[PDB]
């Protein structure tokens, strides 16, 4: 059996780490698993028949310090409405905006949302939009283990209620949210440590009913290939 196939078994739940930044400062972090995915809200609640586990972005303090930009943050949060939904279906992650804040996204590095090429897209309203495909990710991960390419990116960054900060410091944006499917973070780290020699290393997939896997480098690379053979490509 291929333990990595658990990633795509129908009804499996991934863990998503949500980290929010107000003007470049981390203000919130929560890890969420839910069959419905997650939904970023300002808890100006709200509709309980909306889909997705509600993830409430914190109201900034009423402080005199930073009152200007924080009042703008509060305004953005107050206009989130139904919010920003993110969920998985098969090998794809999907997003939809359910309120009035135009939201732009990119798949980027963990520590930098805007590497210079602009957003990958705008999150649609009234229909779903694909924001991540596991297929190319695993292909690129295999290439990475073979010393033939960069580590594949998996951090979804959302710029909420403003234009994407192309050629502008991202820390000036009012509300930036990073979502990391922690299985993908784990898969990349497993590739990094495995290239170091070739004994056994442990990978934790951080998905429902998962158990930490102790694998050799050859075992790991073999499972990635078998996984990719059963996935969909254009």
């Amino acid at each position: 059996e291929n333990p990595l196939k658990r990633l795509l078994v129908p009804g499996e739940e991934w863990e998503f780490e949500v980290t929010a930044f107000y003007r470049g400062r981390q203000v919130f972090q929560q890890t969420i698993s839910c069959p419905e995915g997650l939904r970023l809200v300002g808890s100006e609640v709200g509709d309980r028949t909306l889909p997705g586990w509600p993830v409430t972005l914190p109201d900034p303090g009423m402080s005199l310090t930073d009152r200007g930009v924080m009042s703008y943050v509060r305004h953005v949060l107050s206009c989130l409405g139904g919010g920003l939904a993110l969920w998985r279906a098969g090998q794809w992650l999907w997003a939809q905006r359910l309120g009035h804040c135009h939201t732009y996204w990119a798949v980027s590095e963990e520590l930098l949302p805007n590497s210079g090429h602009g957003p990958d897209g705008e999150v649609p309203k009234d229909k779903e939009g694909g924001v991540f495909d596991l297929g190319p990710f695993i292909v690129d991960l295999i290439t990475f283990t073979e010393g033939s390419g960069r580590s594949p990116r998996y951090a979804l960054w959302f710029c909420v209620g403003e234009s994407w900060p192309q050629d502008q410091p991202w820390t000036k944006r009012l509300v930036m949210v990073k979502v990391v499917p922690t299985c993908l973070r784990a898969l990349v780290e497993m590739a990094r440590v495995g290239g170091a020699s070739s004994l056994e290393n442990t990978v934790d997939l951080h998905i429902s009913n998962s158990h930490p896997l102790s694998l050799t480098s050859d075992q790991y690379k073999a499972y990635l290939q078998d996984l990719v053979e059963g996935m969909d490509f254009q």
Binding site: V69, V76, C101, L174
Partner: peptide, 14 residues
């Protein structure tokens, strides 16, 4: 500045 935030803001109306 407030002018820059106002310019970059993208929130549609009800």
């Amino acid at each position: 500045s407030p002018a820059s935030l106002a310019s970059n803001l993208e929130i549609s109306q009800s």
